[PDB]
Amino acid sequence: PDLKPGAGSFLFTGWAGKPLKVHYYAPDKITETTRILFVIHGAGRNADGYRDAWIPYAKEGQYIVLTPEYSMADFPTSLTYNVGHIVDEAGNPRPREEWSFASIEPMFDQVRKATGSKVPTYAIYGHSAGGQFVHRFVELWPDARYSRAVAANAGWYTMPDLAIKYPYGLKDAPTDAAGLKATLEKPLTILLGTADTDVNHHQLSRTPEAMTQGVHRLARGEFFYAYGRKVAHELNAKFAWKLDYAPDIAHSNTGMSQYAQKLVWE
């Protein structure tokens, strides 16, 4: 069909999962070099706000913004959304095309088909639970066509460790040593707010497995990056991850996006 100039939404059904309402921003003129940025919301499923936060930057960069709404009704738990839904709540394996990750690539096709843009890649950004979604999408979707993925202020990480069990590591995860080696060469950027340091934040995991990564989101992000560098040395991977900071920003998608807007096109 179409995408309307400005802010809007469409219902996406071109995948094996549930229909997804995608809130978008489109520039006034779409050319065939108009870029496309996926913005992934957090646990509050505030997709409408996440698209709005990037509207000014998409207008000044003249690119499309896509924010899928993983509503509470259709994705009630974190396991159904940012953990990827690779198993149901009972532990039974689910088909890969029904994972929450499986919507990005076909959706990336459809919007191109509807706008006329022919860009071979997209950029993707996520904050908090969206940051978990994005770095797990990097770890478990080797086929993805992102030029850069930005994970901002994730609460805790799936660590690049083949001996730690999912979702705290890549043991019992759909990847192996070669896949991990390729993951360490992907253009992933961990962006952390220097004030995301409250060890008692009301959304912060304090499970022992999460505490092995650090006491707050900033420490955990730094430690996840360093662990990636270590295992990249172990596997002789050409380490491509990047570590960036948002000075004096905490767990705020607006403040983090103001800095991430200068990172997704790297």
Q: In sequence order, which residues have a C-beta less than 8 Å from that of residue 140 and are 6 or more positions away?
A: 84, 86, 101, 173, 174, 175
For CA atoms 215, 83, 20, 44, give the dihedral sign: negative
Counting Cα atoms < 13 Å in the Cβ hemisphere of 139 gives 30
Long-range contact set of residues 204-209: C-beta below 8 Å, sequence gap at least 24: 204/155, 205/155, 205/156, 209/164, 209/168
Token pair of 163, please?
Answer: 């001996």
Within a 10 A sphere around the Cβ of 186, how many other Cβ atoms?
18
- Closest Cα to residue 43, out of 158, 130, 134? 130
Counting Cα atoms < 13 Å in the Cβ hemisphere of 109 gives 8
d(CA 91, CA 101) in angstroms, rounded, equals 18
Ordered by where they begin, the domains of the chain are 6-261 (3.40.50.1820)
The structure was resolved to a resolution in Å of 2.4
Long-range contact set of residues 57-60: C-beta below 8 Å, sequence gap at least 24: 57/257, 57/261, 58/25, 58/27, 59/25, 59/27
List gaps in the chain by the residue before each (C–N > 2.5 Å): none
d(CA 208, CA 170) in angstroms, rounded, equals 17
Going by DSSP bridges, is the β-strand pair 188-193/242-246 parallel, antiparallel, or unpaired?
Answer: parallel
d(CA 25, CA 37) in angstroms, rounded, equals 10
d(CA 41, CA 193) in angstroms, rounded, equals 17
3-state secondary structure (DSSP) of residue 21: strand
The answer to whether the beta carbons of residues 24 and 65 sit under 8 Å apart is: yes
- Say which amino acid occupies 20: L
Q: Which helix (H) or strand (E) holds 219?
A: helix 217-234
Token pair of 198, please?
Answer: 């409250």
3-state secondary structure (DSSP) of residue 100: helix
Q: Can you give the three-state secondary structure of 220-240, one letter per residue?
A: HHHHHHHHHHHHHHHCCCCCC
Q: Residue-wise over 227-239: b if at least 16 C-beta within 10 A, else e?
A: bbeebbeebebeb
